Amino acid sequence: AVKRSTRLGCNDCREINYLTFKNVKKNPEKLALNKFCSRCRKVVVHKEVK
Amino acid sequence: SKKGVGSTKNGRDSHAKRLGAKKADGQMIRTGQIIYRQRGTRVYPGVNVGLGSDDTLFALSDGLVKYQKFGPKQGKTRVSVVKHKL
Amino acid sequence: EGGQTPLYRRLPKFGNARKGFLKQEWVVLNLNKIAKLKLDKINRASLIEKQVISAKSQLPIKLIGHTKLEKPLHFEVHKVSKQALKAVENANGSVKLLE
Amino acid sequence: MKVKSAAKKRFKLTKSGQIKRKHAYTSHLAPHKTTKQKRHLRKQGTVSASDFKRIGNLI
RNA sequence: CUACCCUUGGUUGUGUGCUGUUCUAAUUGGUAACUGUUAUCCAGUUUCAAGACAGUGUUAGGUGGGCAGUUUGACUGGGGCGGUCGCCUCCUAAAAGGUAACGGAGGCGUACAAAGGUACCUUCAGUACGGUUGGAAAUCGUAUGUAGAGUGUAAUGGUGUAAGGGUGCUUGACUGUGAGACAUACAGGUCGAACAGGUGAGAAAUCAGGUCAUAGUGAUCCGGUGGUCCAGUAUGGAAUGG
RNA sequence: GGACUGUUUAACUAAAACACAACUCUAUGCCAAACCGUAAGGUGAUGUAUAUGGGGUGACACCUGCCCAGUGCUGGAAGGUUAAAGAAGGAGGUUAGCGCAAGCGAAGCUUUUAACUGAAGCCCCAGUGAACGGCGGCCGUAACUAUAACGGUCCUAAGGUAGCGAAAUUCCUAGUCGGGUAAAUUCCGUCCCGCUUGAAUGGUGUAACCAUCUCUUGACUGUCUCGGCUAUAGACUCGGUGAAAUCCAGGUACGGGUGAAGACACCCGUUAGGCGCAACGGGACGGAAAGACCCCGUGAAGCUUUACUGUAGCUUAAUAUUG
RNA sequence: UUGUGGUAGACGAGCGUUGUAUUGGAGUUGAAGUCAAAGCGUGAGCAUUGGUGGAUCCAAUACAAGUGAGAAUGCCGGCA
RNA sequence: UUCUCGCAGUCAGACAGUGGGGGAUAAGCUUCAUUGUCAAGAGGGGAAGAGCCCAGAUCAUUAAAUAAGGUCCCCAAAAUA
RNA sequence: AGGGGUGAAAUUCCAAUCGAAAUCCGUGAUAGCUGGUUCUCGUCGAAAUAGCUUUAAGGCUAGCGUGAGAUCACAAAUAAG
RNA sequence: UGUCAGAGCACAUUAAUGUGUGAUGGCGUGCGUUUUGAAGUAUGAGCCGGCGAGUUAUGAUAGCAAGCGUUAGUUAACCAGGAGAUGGGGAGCUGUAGCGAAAGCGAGUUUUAAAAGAGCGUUUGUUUGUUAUUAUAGACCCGAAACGGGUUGAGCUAGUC
RNA sequence: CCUGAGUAGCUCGGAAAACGUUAUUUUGAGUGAAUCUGCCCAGACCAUUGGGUAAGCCUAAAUACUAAUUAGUGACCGAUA
RNA sequence: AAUAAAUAGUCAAUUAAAGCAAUACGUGGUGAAGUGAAACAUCUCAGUAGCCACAGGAAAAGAAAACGAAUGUGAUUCCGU
């Protein structure tokens, strides 16, 4: 269908973390959130990776 | 006779999800087990009953399911769980 | 099954890179079964006369178990189990780890 | 007879029978399911009650 | 001046295959003569015509029902034409569930980083009244007003201090799980206590495992990307595999 | 209608079918094009453009019109696309060694794709009509009308030329009208709103001819009103021999009703001494072919095609032959 | 006490039949064979005798089966 | 009528009643739900009758009493007001 | 002399019938489709639904049957509240 | 179109309510097949008689029973012999540990940070004979036109010399 | 000094090897080596290590078969076999 | 002989089969379809069937650039695993 998926990766451990749905038709603005990370066992800021 | 005509768009029955009070009065039900399943509110939670976030009901504590009628003309229904302490 | 997709075909596959090889052959020795039999200085020369292994034996040894015994176990084996080590060493036997 | 090797590439022999398997929904994509049912998928599963006769005859 | 970047044209300038040539010795010839032989076969000696061509062989192409093997779904008040094939809501459906139809309706292949979560604040729509443009109907103030307002939307139910409108922080729109359960031919689908870590909001108790829910979706093969405490055909690697 | 002497699907149909000279278009200059087959070899052919092969119509008279939009064909060369193949390279890996590590990396070899050259062919442009093929609609328009000579407009590449036309072609339509005919859904002539006539899958006519089709008439009659007679060979008898198909068993009525839904057997009522002969046949859902009409089969077989995949074959190119 | 309708279908118990292996028995004073007859049995089955016949047969048990016929538009042959 | 196993048969059902849909509230019509029968199980009544009622049958017997149903004759038994 | 020929062409013909002769073998081909498939007795004893299926007269599971072993009173219905 | 009764008729036994026959009375739509359902005007069967369709080899599962057993048991093939049973011959097999993809660990293992939770396990037989079902092989039987290749064929017919 | 040269390889297609073309073996085309401190092999492949030394020929014996002869056997058939 | 020589060719002589068949097995080469896959186009029977060729009483492969991963075995072939 309308392929809208964007995969999320870590900034330091570079682990692939989550699949989210990003609204570029409204904003091309990049998003950097913080979520779980296993290799360091804590909440770390992750980004999107194309 | 037998000929093809325009469309009379479907009345095909969507898969009927089983709904209703899976548990009845007089039964001992522990924590976790669900009681009533609905998509569209008709019964309310009282105490000791948990609301799974699809308008679904389940038991929060061990006890017996019990009903209460109330509202503007006692048509509204709220469900709860009564305890039996030793 | 009368024209359906087979169950083993709708299931995911199990992958392994040991393909082109086989599992690692080793003869097992557990404390429970050897408790029935009486023998000391258990080696290659011991199991052949007890018919446990063949004359063409080439398989190395596991030692396995944590049960208790009152006999002086005497093994000369390639590897061991730590619980088995505790069990044999408490019994005042002999422990030889001969790879 | 012979043994259906293609089938047995997908099972894992277990003690006293009672074959197990992997939760089966993954070939092409999963950007439609919540992580809860994802980790339900991550668990290995077992065959149902009825399919024991349907699998044993293959063995 | 020092240079760089350009454009078109001219000089040769090194190589790239080429349609253009010369010669005959490869080679061709259903040119012609002679010996076998007196033989419309043939071979040899050759002449002539040519000729590095053609043809042959391999390869790569384009073309090629001439031919070869196959296919040309199902459902159905006969068949074909028509229409339909997945999932969601209402009625049918006999106040439990479930209940057919080539039954009537509607729909869909979603959107949202906020329209969520948190903490706080706040409420009908509408009627009438009086009020600069301002008229059926703009918005202000007041009372009236029990839902006819909104509910991200197709529908259903509920949602009157709310799941709605606004304000501040944030992306729990977590990880590993998971007792217990619902419905269940398989596939499967659905919730969820609770534990442990990490958090966030809130003073905190508490809440946050996405949206008020019911739809927004396809098994499996195959190939790929990132990471990986996995293996490495004697070994060490490596490739590749997991 | 066919021109015609002509040919045929033995054993359903014989001709308006086929052939047919004649004409038409195209291709072919020798070891020819073309054909058989794998190939020698052979035909065409011991042929040589007044010749051959293929295609089309089908005496003859007079004509065959518009369009190359698309495809088919032919040519062309600027331009874009285009395989294989040749190879300026690229990075990775082993580590001799350099290396405290961290790593770097000689040479050899492997991995793998690329700068560039790169045929035919496709797109391109012209021609191509007795090729495949087709040849439109609307609106307005004329001092009686009606109509459309005409013009404009939308699209196409082009909007049917001539001719004929209710006919082997026309649903409407048993069109109108005329005659024919006592009495005309048939006949023909005739007017042309021809759903779509229509020019080489020809058009209009064409004398003879056709076991051709159709209509009328003359004679002619048992075709008919309208049936009868005679003689034969049986069928009838006697004599010689002497089958066949079919068959669960039959001591095998009628009416009504029921019934697997149409009765010789069922139920209810009526009727018939036993056994034959000549017979003609109502039925026994008569006999004779697991129904060919019809459905299904994930049947088969055959047929066609721009359905899929390939091949025979044709054509273009690199290579060894090959200087 | 329940019992005993019964389709496909399932469970259960048996009979006969050909040969082999044994302990036995009979046989021109007529075996197996055949048909006839006023039998036996819960069933597959078992008989008694006569006549024709002229030579091997039968009881009990164990084994193995080309081991049980109304149908197949059945076949073969024959008679209707 | 739960648990494990073997063997199954089995997806072309029909009829009667009750409620609907289509149909035309027409249908020995079609399709769903419910109660019974036949199929899969014979019989007495309905004049016979596949589904209706009474009903559920080991065999034999020259027993009786009933069910539905019936009692003018066939054809079993009835009369009284 | 037959993925052939022949042919004044219609599927003409090919040893009395051919959309590609007759025969050999492959082959005991295949056919979700019919027809049939042989001793007795005892007992229990069905369905004809749902879902899926290039599936619709083929198949698979659940369901409803049976045999054996069970669980065997917190299990199952039959009455009432 | 026979049964149940029944005269009547004629004889006299596997000693048996004797046998044989039956004027009449009561009753009464064949056999299978497919099937919702066939008495059927659905299908097939003239008939007698012969014959005529569940097996083999391997193997799995399950059942019954037996043997064996607490490291058992089982020998294949092969050699020896009455081509016999059998003897020799463990070569392998089931089991005593499984878990995980694996390294590896081990009554623990897998995920995980987790020896948290969860899943598996927390020993439960061997070899035979028989039976039932079943997969490979034409594997109940009979049946399709067909398809492939190889042969016989132009003297019918067609044509040609 | 020698020990088998259009050879092994290499490129494009192939087959077999239990493999769907993959180490290995074979070739259809082109290409094309090395000489003892040599080569190749060790399922791509390098280094180390180890194995054995192609591009020459032949070879019994176990193992296959029974139309024929001889003898015998048979829970083989007994004239629709 | 062409062509002088020599060859081609011709003439004369010696040696072996050529052939058939044990209706089977050995090898080499050519080399199917049908069927299954519930269709079918990869596969599948199968390198089977069939055809061609040379022989034998057997024939073929055969003496390590072998297998392969072990301080390994040491022609080829056959049988169970």
Nominal resolution in Å? 6.8
Which residue is it, tokens 């998928």? D41
Q: Is residue C77 within 8 Å of residue C98, measured between CB atoms?
A: yes
> Which residue from C15, C90, B61 is spatially nearest to D12, judged by alpha carbons?
C15
- DSSP letter at C45 equals H
Which residues share a beta bridge with B51?
Answer: B57
Method: cryo-EM
Task: For residue A15, give both structure tokens.
Answer: 């682990």
D interface with C, Cβ–Cβ below 8 Å: 4, 6-7, 9-12, 21-22, 24, 26, 51, 54-55, 58
**C-alpha count within 13 angstroms, C-beta hemisphere, residue C92:** 1
Angle at alpha carbon of residue D33, lines to D39 and B41, rounded to 5°: 105
For chain C, helix (H) and strand (E) counts, in that order, are 4, 4
Domain extents in chain A:
1-50
**Within 7 Å: CB of C3 and strand I?**
yes
Q: Please answer whether residues D44 and D20 qualify as being in contact, where contact means their C-beta atoms are separated by less than 8 angstroms.
A: yes
Alpha carbon A43 to chain centroid, angstroms: 13
Question: Cα(C44)–Cα(C61) distance, rounded to whole angstroms?
Answer: 10
Q: Distance between CA C31 and CA C89 in Å, rounded?
A: 13
Q: Return all residues near C65 (Cβ < 8 A) that are at least 6 apart.
A: C30, C31, C32, C81, C83, C84, C87
Instruction: Classify residue C27 by its DSSP letter.
Output: E
Concatenated DSSP letters of C46-87? HHHHTTSS-TT----EEEE------S--EEEES---HHHHHH
Query: Any residues with CB less than 8 A from the CB of B3 and at least 6 apart, and which?
Result: none
- What are the residue ranges spanned by the domains of chain C? 26-99
Percentages helix, strand, coil for chain B (3-state, rounded to 5) are 0, 40, 60
Residue D7 one-letter amino acid: A
Residue C2's nearest nucleotide, by CA–C1', is I59
Tell me the nearest-neighbour CA distance from C50 into chain D, angstroms. Answer: 29
Using a CB–CB cutoff of 8 Å, tell me whether D31 touches chain A.
Answer: yes
Nucleotides of H under 7 A from a protein CB: 4-6
CA atoms within 13 A on the CB side of A28: 0
* Two structure tokens written together for D27: 């070939």
